[PDB]
Design a protein around this ligand. Structure first.
Ligand SMILES: CS(=O)(=O)c1ccccc1-c1ccc(N2CC[C@H](NS(=O)(=O)CCc3ccc(Cl)s3)C2=O)c(F)c1
Lengths: 232, 54
């Protein structure tokens, strides 16, 4: 996260972090339930064996619990060539215990989310990624309000094809964006003090560059898929 | 112009769906719809979508 602020105590409890064999975060995730994490499909190629950590706001200090993954469910249409269908569900070996800073984000119903959440002014993105394009990962969990960006303006801004499985959020010039290490993580939209999963950090042309926005997997396109994935 | 679910989310706390030209409210898993048929009440602790206070 470039810009924005620290998640203060209990503000981002659906955040998950995929950690490599070296105990370092390489991607984010969203807690959907005690057994399931939502992430990006492209994050499954950024490490061989990995685990999921939750309840961590400050990685340098000590809520935290590491969980092993039992099942990796990658969307079968994802490819690196297009980045389309960039979604994956993880089933954990042991259930997450909800507590301070550890709680799931709500999955919305499709029609309602599209007419009511995705038409709100902004969503919130969060993660332990870099604090500027060429810096190092953040030791602190951060969040950022990212304006939803008109599909057209976004298609015009992009050098790659924005599919219907993607949406854009962020700023044209303001130095606030998601970045490296945030991928796979949460985009949520607040409605009457309840936070709903709206997107998955997917890709961008750098981080916070002008004329450029963050590209997010459109969770509403995948609700049935997710629902299915969570039943087995 | 603005009617039912397009008028302030039909007064629902969460999901609003128009059925037979009337507002029908519903809630995410782990919440139950109150007797008023609008409010969503958490069934247990750590309901989805809420920042944690404890
Ligand atoms: C370049 S590509 O792989 O041919 C391709 C093809 C079709 C659609 C998109 C892309 C694409 C384009 C740019 C991509 N980049 C360039 C580097 C960047 N990596 S990152 O780890 O810094 C992610 C940064 C983000 C900023 C905002 C969000 Cl959201 S994610 C990133 O995601 C990328 F991963 C994929």
């Amino acid at each position: 996260i470039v810009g924005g602020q620290e998640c203060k105590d209990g503000e981002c409890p659906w955040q998950a972090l995929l950690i490599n064999e070296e105990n370092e975060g390489f991607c984010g995730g969203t807690i959907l339930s005690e057994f399931y994490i939502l992430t990006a499909a492209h994050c499954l190629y950024q490490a061989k064996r990995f685990k999921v950590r939750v309840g961590d706001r400050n990685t340098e200090q000590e809520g935290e619990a590491v969980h092993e993954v039992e099942v990796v469910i990658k969307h079968n249409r994802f490819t690196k060539e297009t980045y389309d269908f960039d979604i994956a569900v993880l089933r954990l070996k042991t259930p997450i215990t909800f507590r301070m800073n550890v709680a799931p984000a709500c999955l919305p119903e499709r029609d309602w989310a599209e007419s009511t959440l995705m038409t709100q002014k902004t969503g919130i993105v969060s993660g332990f990624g870099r604090t500027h394009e060429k810096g190092r990962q953040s030791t602190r969990l951060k969040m950022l309000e990212v304006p939803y960006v008109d599909r057209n303006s976004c298609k015009l801004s992009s050098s790659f094809i924005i599919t219907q499985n993607m949406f854009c959020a962020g700023y044209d010039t303001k130095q606030e964006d998601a970045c490296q290490g945030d991928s796979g993580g949460p985009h949520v939209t607040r409605f009457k003090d309840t936070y709903f999963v709206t997107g998955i950090v997917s890709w961008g042309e750098g981080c916070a560059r002008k004329g450029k926005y963050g590209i997010y997997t459109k969770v509403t396109a995948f609700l049935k898929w997710i629902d299915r994935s969570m039943k087995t | 112009t603005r009617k039912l679910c397009s008028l302030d989310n039909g007064d629902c706390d969460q999901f609003c769906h128009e059925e037979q030209n009337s507002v029908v409210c519903s809630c995410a898993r782990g919440y139950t719809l109150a007797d008023n048929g609008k409010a969503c009440i958490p069934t247990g602790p750590y309901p989805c979508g809420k920042q944690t206070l404890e």
